[PDB]
Amino acid sequence: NGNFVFDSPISKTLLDQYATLPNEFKFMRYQAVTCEPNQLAEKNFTVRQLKYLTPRETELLVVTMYNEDHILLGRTLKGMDNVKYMVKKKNSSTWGPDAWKKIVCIISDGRSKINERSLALLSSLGCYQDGFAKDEINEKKVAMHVYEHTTMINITNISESEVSLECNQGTVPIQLLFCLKEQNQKKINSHRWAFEGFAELLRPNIVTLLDAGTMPGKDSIYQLWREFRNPNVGGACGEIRTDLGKRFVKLLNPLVASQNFEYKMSNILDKTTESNFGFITVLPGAFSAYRFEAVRGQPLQKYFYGEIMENEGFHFFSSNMYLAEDRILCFEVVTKKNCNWILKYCRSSYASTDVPERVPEFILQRRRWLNGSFFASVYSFCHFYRVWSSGHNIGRKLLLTVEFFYLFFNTLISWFSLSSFFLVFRILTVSIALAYHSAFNVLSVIFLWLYGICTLSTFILSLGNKPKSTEKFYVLTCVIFAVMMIYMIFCSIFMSVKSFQNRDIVISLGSTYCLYLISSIIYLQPWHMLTSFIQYILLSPSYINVLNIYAFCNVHDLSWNPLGKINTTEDGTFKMEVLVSSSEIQANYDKYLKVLNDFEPSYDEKKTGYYANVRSLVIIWVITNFIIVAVVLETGGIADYIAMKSISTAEIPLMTSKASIYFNVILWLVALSALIRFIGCSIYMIVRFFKKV
Amino acid sequence: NGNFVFDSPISKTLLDQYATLPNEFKFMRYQAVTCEPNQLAEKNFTVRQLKYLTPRETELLVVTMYNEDHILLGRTLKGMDNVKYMVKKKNSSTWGPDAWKKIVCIISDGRSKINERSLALLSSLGCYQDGFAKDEINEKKVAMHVYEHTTMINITNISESEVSLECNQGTVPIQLLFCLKEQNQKKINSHRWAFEGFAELLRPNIVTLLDAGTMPGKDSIYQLWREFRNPNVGGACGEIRTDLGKRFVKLLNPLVASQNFEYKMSNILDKTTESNFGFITVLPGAFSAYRFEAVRGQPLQKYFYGEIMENEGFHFFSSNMYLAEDRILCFEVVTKKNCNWILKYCRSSYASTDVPERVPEFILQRRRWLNGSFFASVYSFCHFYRVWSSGHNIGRKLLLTVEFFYLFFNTLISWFSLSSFFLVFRILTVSIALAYHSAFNVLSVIFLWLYGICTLSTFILSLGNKPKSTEKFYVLTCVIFAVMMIYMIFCSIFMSVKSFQNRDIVISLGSTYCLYLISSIIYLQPWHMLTSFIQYILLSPSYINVLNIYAFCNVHDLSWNPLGKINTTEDGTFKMEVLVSSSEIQANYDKYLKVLNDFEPSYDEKKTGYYANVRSLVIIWVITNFIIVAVVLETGGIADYIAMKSISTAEIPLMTSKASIYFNVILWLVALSALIRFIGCSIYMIVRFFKKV
Ligand SMILES: C[C@@H]([C@H](N)C(=O)N[C@H](C(=O)O)[C@H]1O[C@@H](n2ccc(=O)[nH]c2=O)[C@H](O)[C@@H]1O)[C@H](O)c1ccc(O)cn1
Ligand SMILES: C[C@@H]([C@H](N)C(=O)N[C@H](C(=O)O)[C@H]1O[C@@H](n2ccc(=O)[nH]c2=O)[C@H](O)[C@@H]1O)[C@H](O)c1ccc(O)cn1
């Protein structure tokens, strides 16, 4: 039909296990796509599911990959376990002995970057054969290499070294569909291929987004698909668990134990609370599910292209919304016009992913998350009236409004954290010295200077340099801040012990831990509340001061005729035309005489200019935090101003009463959020328990 | 001789004026160079001067150009006036009726960037004809297009619009030699072509470096050549005067009046004082002269290549000396082994250049000068022992040692200026409020906050952004600092008036102006001491705080198979070889099975890493200035520390006595330098007067 397709046989060694035979199993199809992802249908491209005597009707998985090795891809593919569980499911109206026919997509990204040890595994499965890729077809550049087949072998064990494949009477067929882009176009393009391309052909019911390296549990995909029984749910997500290795031998890295605790409390407290209202801020791209009908239309338009209505110039939201990439989908689904979709959190389905283990990789990873969450929250709050233009009933609309206000309260608290941390630190360290005089004077001065030097260097290195160039310094900074936090804990314990012997710093901070602990107990998963709490506490002054500074200082990732030839022989003789005619010489001379007598750059450069002027206006964050510091501590010359006024009608005081008032406000304002999230987690568990009963 | 040369005739219209005839005048020579600049001789390349019956012996001009229009190049070429003066010179042993035969080079830089309205002028002179450039010759890429001729027409007037050429009995011949590089290789390459190339062929006596747009006076080149009568002088330079337009109608821009005053005091005070000792730190590249024998060897090696002795890794001086580009020549000439060359300043020869007129262009220009001077001074001080290994007598060696120590004292004063300015500002503004209470409290706080915000924004914008993107902000910053300086002057005048009615701020600062004025009077050029003093005073808080911050924050200018094809007919049928043999399929499958079973980047990136780690260690300047601020004002928690100590055996004081002591030290330390430079200028003028008498 004007398109290039090919159909090769597989190696007879595969046939040896396959016999232990239809046209689906013995052959593979290589369609080569050259068009745009949004044209597969009208360019006469098909897939094997639409070719049979009765076309197959798909019920359910996109696995994005870039350069992951074969162990990560093996883990994702092994998590085949879900498909096997779903065929062996007996008492069901949707799944049964032939369930695999209703489940189908591995989107690679560029041939140069792909790890050929993973192409090895894809070929072992039988979904790729080298030899017949075609880098252009009839003056049209190929864009996609689509291999398809239907294997019989399953990954059954994964050591640290090898992936074990087998083909028995107990394995189940898998309808693989391997897409190979010839070039890296970033993840958004891959999702573009998955949603605007093959999803329009297959017409699935649910689209589940996995991520190479993420291993769903033995039932997790089934438990996620069960969330969509409710005809209102539009998206869903499950728990993401840090992979702690064999014998939990990766819970030693303090950067991995920190992330384990952080993920675990994010799931227990934040996600259940959000799911009560009906709008989860981010559905993780490593393990999420969308009802296809829910996202078609406005959500995908906003995700892939952006706010289309725009002039030639740049606008804030329209030209910056690309920084909140996969979080636009959630907001546009929940607030869709004339539809009542909601987002649900399923805690019965988990997936264990791999986390960064070195400080530079970790910083670069969180640079994306922090900018995405900040821009997404600003967009959600500045556009929350859309909630009232949607189709929900009035109760749900009120709940969503309350949740949006609570989420903005949280983002504001997080914006003022640079100053909250310093103020708590300096108020506490000066107060202990004023109380006891012994050696806390010198430590107060020393720690002020250490904080100042580390913060100065973090601004300078993040604005100018790159984390890979200077890793020793970032490790040293994290160690310095850990020691500072230890000193803060010692000071609080000392002050409280002496005060008891002779106060609210224990009634508020103790509640936050007791409430954290009780929420973990309610969730029936408390084992992180001791193995990894200390690392989080110690690596927490660095999540406030190093990841935030780097995140805001690197918002946008800026990036600032042949008129002759002479060939001669060994002798060196040749000739060409020479402008011999003196009239033409005079003509050229008069041309230059008259030339003497006749007395914005690229859109890319203009866009880079705009992007770099918006990264430099958000940092100048610093002023609004210093305003708080100056008001409370009376820095900035304000105390001098008050003293001079008193003289006009004197001496400056060491520590004032604004410090006490503020340092109470922060402790109770951080106890309040823990209280709210504990109540939310309790409601979630209780409602789930009644519905299960 | 294996090289491509060509010899075209000129237009007969030129012949019309030339008649009003030898082979030098009627023809032009286009040699095309493809080799390296240091190979012109042994590759059998010549110039017309070596071809005559008796080869010409050159006595004396390289004019670097990039994209200057035809007015600037016209001005440089007009300043032909010097050659005419030198032929009409009667009573001389070197110059006479045929002096032009001893004077010869215009080094363009790339055909793409050259302003074709200047190619118009070069063709009007008769030294370029389009039609026979050859972009490659016998598998060798052309590197240089060398046109040569010997004109008769002279530029006699330059309006704002046109350049007036004429050919009479009164004009004089000029031996032009137009070099056109096919690509931009930066100025260092052009000087490489000028010195290592054509200068080895011509063997001149003096090499004078002009720069397109700079117009030497009617006698300036002759007066510069006269400095080399002394067989010890190795280099020389003249005064550079800002071009103030017709009717001085450019002395209105405050950025141009500032630069006029700055250039004028640099010439009067700095350069005469340096020339007394015998070592001028920078000979400006816009108008300088070097005795060719003086610079051959070590100076040119260090200028063009660098400290050759080096390992694979990077070292500070060896790998950063390229930032001090034309200042290495001076240091290496003066301290040359077994030679007693000195550098001399000639005030009888001037040249009027064009200056930047918008803040972004000005900032980008001074970014080069400040980094160059800082690295050159560090290199000169860290290597000053070389002075004692040279050939000078002991008196000159002692004088050079004293001068080197004085120059390091100056560079240290300039390194601590960021803190000196703030300390003077805050001590003065707080002191006036403590004295009079009226409305100086509020102004003290307001100006502290304005200073803080402008300095924060200058760090952030210079570390992240570019000056062209944000020009409104830099203009606003300069205005803010001008207002601050006005307030500083008001405060000092008010305090002094009240103190006289009831002190050293007038005996020191008044001396600095009286000494500036007296030096200008001695120099017989005082007219800048009123037309442009106010602009310099007001635009001076910005030379300390905006150009220095930008200069140190931008030290180094960082910059971070086809395996198929298918063509078919309209029907779409074709065939190629297919790996049909199943044995080869099994072979490939086993190849991937075994692939599964088998379980630093570019030198440019490493160099960029090193460069960006050295720009980030020099800024972290900030700490050593803040140490001074903290010691004097008792910021940084030191005053709190003292108060807590006093309690351990209380209240903080507003203003202490360290402020008074420091604020005396700065005023007298800035009066001392003015005194030294006044004495130096006086010695220079007096010695020149006796030698002239
Ligand atoms: C981040 C995620 C996982 N560790 C991961 O790395 N995800 C990548 C990503 O987020 O970009 C995926 O993107 C693909 N990719 C990369 C470069 C490219 O150029 N194109 C392209 O497609 C990569 O191969 C990879 O599969 C982690 O588990 C997680 C996420 C959310 C959460 O709440 C908790 N945990
Ligand atoms: C700066 C100088 C003059 N205004 C100027 O602009 N000099 C350029 C420079 O310093 O680079 C020259 O360099 C050439 N150039 C440029 C780009 C390139 O890529 N390659 C290349 O050769 C340009 O054409 C130009 O002639 C000014 O008068 C001055 C200097 C010192 C001083 O004490 C007082 N005043």
Among B448, B460, B586, the residue with its CB nearest the CB of A619 is B460
Query: Residues A591, A595, A596, A602: is their CA dihedral positive or negative?
Result: negative
Transcribe A598-634 into DSSP letters: T----HHHHHHHHHHHHHHHHH--HHHHHHHHHHHH-
Distance from C-alpha of A200 to C-alpha of A38, rounded to nearest angstrom: 9
User: Nearest residue CA, atom 27 of ligand 2?
Assistant: B286
Longest dimension (CA), chain A: 111
Q: Which of B287, B282, B283, B284 is nearest to B210 (CA)?
A: B287
List strand residue ranges (DSSP E) for A303-446, in order: 342-353
User: Nearest residue CA, atom 18 of ligand 1?
Assistant: A186
Is residue A648 less than 8 Å (CB to CB) from chain B? Answer: yes
Would you say A260 and A532 are in contact if contact means Cβ atoms under 8 Å apart? yes
Would you say A44 and A165 are in contact if contact means Cβ atoms under 8 Å apart? no
Q: Which of B456, B437, B436, B438 is nearest to B448 (CA)?
A: B456
Contacts of B448 in chain A (CB under 8 A): 636-637
User: Nearest residue CA, atom 2 of ligand 2?
Assistant: B286
**Phi, psi (5° rounding) for residue A340?**
-115, 40
Is residue A605 less than 8 Å (CB to CB) from chain B? Answer: no
Would you say A164 and A93 are in contact if contact means Cβ atoms under 8 Å apart? no
User: What residues are in contact with ligand 1 under a 6 Å CB criterion?
Assistant: A 64-66, 68, 109, 184, 186-187, 190, 211-214, 240, 284-286, 353-354
Q: Which helix (H) or strand (E) segment is B460 a member of? A: helix B440-464
Would you say A257 and A251 are in contact if contact means Cβ atoms under 8 Å apart? yes
Task: Considering only CA atoms, give the Rg of chain B.
Answer: 31
Q: What length is written for chain A? A: 693
Method used to determine the 3D structure: cryo-EM
Distance from C-alpha of A237 to C-alpha of A345, rounded to nearest angstrom: 5
Looking from the CA of B163 toward its CB, the CA atoms found within 13 Å total 26
Q: How far is CA B359 from CA B242, B321, B539, in A?
A: 17, 28, 11
Transcribe B132-181 into DSSP letters: ---SBBSS-B--EEEEE--B--EEEEE-SS-EEEE-SSS---B--EEEEE
Look up residue B226 and give its amino acid: R
Strand partners, A235: A290, A343
**Phi, psi (5° rounding) for residue B223?**
-65, -30
A669-A670-A673 Cα angle (round to 5): 90
Checking B43-47 for CB contacts under 8 A at 24+ apart, the result is: B43/B3, B44/B1, B44/B2, B44/B3, B45/B3, B45/B201, B46/B201, B47/B146, B47/B148, B47/B177, B47/B198, B47/B201, B47/B202
List strand residue ranges (DSSP E) for B360-512, in order: none
- Residue labelled with tokens 């351990």: B648
Which tokens sit at B273?
């004082």
* Residue partners of A637: CB distance under 8 A and separation at least 6: B444, B445, B448, B449
- If phi > 0 it is left, if psi is from -120 to 50 it is alpha, else beta; for residue A306 that is left
Mutate to test the pocket of ligand 1, among A211, A259, A557 (most ligand atoms within 8 A of CB): A211
Looking from the CA of A574 toward its CB, the CA atoms found within 13 Å total 13
Interface test with A, best of B640, B641, B648, B651 (most A CBs within 10 A): B640
Would you say B340 and B396 are in contact if contact means Cβ atoms under 8 Å apart? yes
Distance from C-alpha of A45 to C-alpha of A32, rounded to nearest angstrom: 9
Q: Determine the residue of chain A that is closest to B11 in CA distance.
A: A586
Name residues 62-121 of chain A within 8 A of B (Cβ): 70, 116-117, 119-121
B284, with CB counted inside 10 A (0-12, 13-18, 19+), is: buried
How is residue A652 annotated by DSSP?
A: B
User: Nearest residue CA, atom 16 of ligand 2?
Assistant: B66
**Phi, psi (5° rounding) for residue A326?**
-90, 0
Proximal ligand: closest to the CA of A356: 1
* Helix, strand or coil, per DSSP, at residue A235: strand
CB contact under 8 A, A11 and B586: yes
CA dihedral B189, B190, B196, B201 (to 10 degrees): 150
Distance from C-alpha of A51 to C-alpha of A48, rounded to nearest angstrom: 5
* Residue partners of B57: CB distance under 8 A and separation at least 6: B102, B203
- Residue labelled with tokens 């820095």: A635
Task: Considering only CA atoms, give the Rg of chain A.
Answer: 31
Among B14, B135, B433, the residue with its CB nearest the CB of A565 is B135
Q: Determine the residue of chain A that is closest to B118 in CA distance.
A: A596
Which tokens sit at B385?
């022992």
Q: Which of A274, A305, A112, A101 is nearest to A196 (CA)?
A: A305
A368, with CB counted inside 10 A (0-12, 13-18, 19+), is: middle
| Residue B26 near ligand 2, beta carbon < 6 Å | no
Q: Which of B267, B287, B296 is nearest to B224 (CA)?
A: B287
Look up residue A10 and give its amino acid: I
Distance from C-alpha of A389 to C-alpha of A392, rounded to nearest angstrom: 9
Q: Which of A450-462 are b and which e, b meaning 16 or more Cβ less than 10 Å from the residue's Cβ?
A: ebebbbbbbbbbb
User: Nearest residue CA, atom 32 of ligand 1?
Assistant: A284
Contacts of B637 in chain A (CB under 8 A): 444-445, 448-449
Q: Which of B222, B346, B371 is nearest to B274 (CA)?
A: B346
Helix and strand totals (H; E) in chain A: 29, 13
Q: Which of B492, B494, B498 is nearest to B512 (CA)?
A: B492
Distance from C-alpha of B352 to C-alpha of B240, rounded to nearest angstrom: 6
B440, with CB counted inside 10 A (0-12, 13-18, 19+), is: buried
Contacts of A586 in chain B (CB under 8 A): 11-13
Which tokens sit at A590?
């008069």
Distance from C-alpha of A656 to C-alpha of B160, rounded to nearest angstrom: 68
Helices A359-382/A394-415 angle, 10° precision: 130
Transcribe B54-87 into DSSP letters: S-------EEE-SS--HHHHHHHHH--HHHHHHH
Q: In what order do the strands lie in the sheet with B144-148?
A: B7-9, B27-33, B144-148, B177-181, B106-107
Q: Which of A280, A401, A395, A392 is nearest to A340 (CA)?
A: A392
CB contact under 8 A, A138 and B585: no
- Residue labelled with tokens 């470096």: B209
A271, with CB counted inside 10 A (0-12, 13-18, 19+), is: buried
* Residue partners of A636: CB distance under 8 A and separation at least 6: A626, A630, B445, B448, B449, B452
A477-A482-A487 Cα angle (round to 5): 125
The data reach a resolution, in angstroms, of 2.9
Q: How far is CA A303 from CA A36, A41, A181, A196, A299, in A?
A: 17, 21, 20, 12, 6
Distance from C-alpha of B324 to C-alpha of B332, rounded to nearest angstrom: 12
Distance from C-alpha of A675 to C-alpha of A374, rounded to nearest angstrom: 24
Would you say A607 and A558 are in contact if contact means Cβ atoms under 8 Å apart? no
Q: Which helix (H) or strand (E) segment is A154 a member of? A: strand A154-158
Which tokens sit at B74?
């016209």
Distance from C-alpha of B364 to C-alpha of B573, rounded to nearest angstrom: 62
Distance from C-alpha of A377 to C-alpha of B238, rounded to nearest angstrom: 63
Q: Which of B348, B408, B350 is nearest to B376 (CA)?
A: B408
Distance from C-alpha of A122 to C-alpha of A114, rounded to nearest angstrom: 12
Distance from C-alpha of A448 to C-alpha of B607, rounded to nearest angstrom: 35
Domain boundaries, chain B: 1-213, 230-283+313-415, 417-555+611-692
List strand residue ranges (DSSP E) for A222-341, in order: 233-242, 287-291
Distance from C-alpha of B678 to C-alpha of B522, rounded to nearest angstrom: 10
Q: In what order do the strands lie in the sheet with B62-64?
A: B62-64, B206-211, B287-291, B233-242, B342-353, B215-216
Longest dimension (CA), chain B: 111
* Residue partners of A668: CB distance under 8 A and separation at least 6: A504, A508
Distance from C-alpha of A445 to C-alpha of A425, rounded to nearest angstrom: 12
Helix and strand totals (H; E) in chain B: 29, 13
CA dihedral A587, A593, A597, A601 (to 10 degrees): 90
A532-A534-A538 Cα angle (round to 5): 120
- Residue labelled with tokens 């992936």: A163
Would you say A612 and B465 are in contact if contact means Cβ atoms under 8 Å apart? yes
Q: Which of B593, B585, B591, B590 is nearest to A163 (CA)?
A: B593
Distance from C-alpha of B459 to C-alpha of B462, rounded to nearest angstrom: 5
CB contact under 8 A, B588 and A129: yes
Strand partners, A157: A164
- Residue labelled with tokens 């070039």: A183
